Design a protein around this ligand. Structure first.
Ligand SMILES: N#CCNc1ccccc1
Length: 162
């Protein structure tokens, strides 16, 4: 297991434009296209991202290319964030994957506001952090995925990803 395999499990792979859990146009391995309700706007974003006229469909290679860009950008963002970086750097590699996963799903701003969870994680108070992480819209809206990510934070193992 690694961050790519983990997010591939949590996000799936779809080659045609679909709506994510929040109802937003998305493609590939959880690549958000736009929050606009206009499918044409999503198609425009897709074509811009891939560099050709896709008419709403991409290849597996293209999906994987976006995925690599998205994972890379998620990490680089964490490292640029004054609140997230010290916590991320305090973690072991497995828990770092859980951090990347959450930012990939939620975006960096939302996570940066998890002030109490962040403090507990930096303190390595793992059970307490796990309890705090679940007191969230995140957990309530996507509980099965959040449970996997939280178990990863709690244990520093890949047990939740079989
Ligand atoms: N809070 C929380 C868990 N997620 C996270 C995300 C980025 C850095 C450190 C932790």
């Amino acid at each position: 297991m690694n961050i790519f395999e983990m997010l591939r499990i949590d996000e799936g792979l779809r080659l045609k434009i679909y709506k994510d859990t929040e109802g937003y146009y998305t493609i590939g391995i959880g690549h958000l296209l736009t929050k606009s309700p206009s499918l044409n706007a999503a198609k425009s974003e897709l074509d811009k991202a891939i560099g050709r006229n896709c008419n709403g469909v991409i290849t597996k290679d293209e999906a994987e290319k976006l995925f690599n860009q998205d994972v890379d950008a998620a990490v680089r963002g964490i490292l640029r964030n004054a609140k997230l970086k010290p916590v991320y750097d305090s973690l072991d590699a497995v828990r770092r994957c859980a951090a990347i996963n959450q930012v990939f799903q939620m975006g960096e701003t939302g996570v940066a506001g998890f002030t109490n969870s962040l403090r507990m994680l930096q303190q390595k108070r793992w059970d307490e952090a796990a309890v705090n992480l679940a007191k969230s819209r995140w957990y309530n809206q996507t509980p099965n995925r959040a449970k996997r990510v939280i178990t990863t934070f709690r244990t520093g193992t890949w047990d939740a990803y079989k």
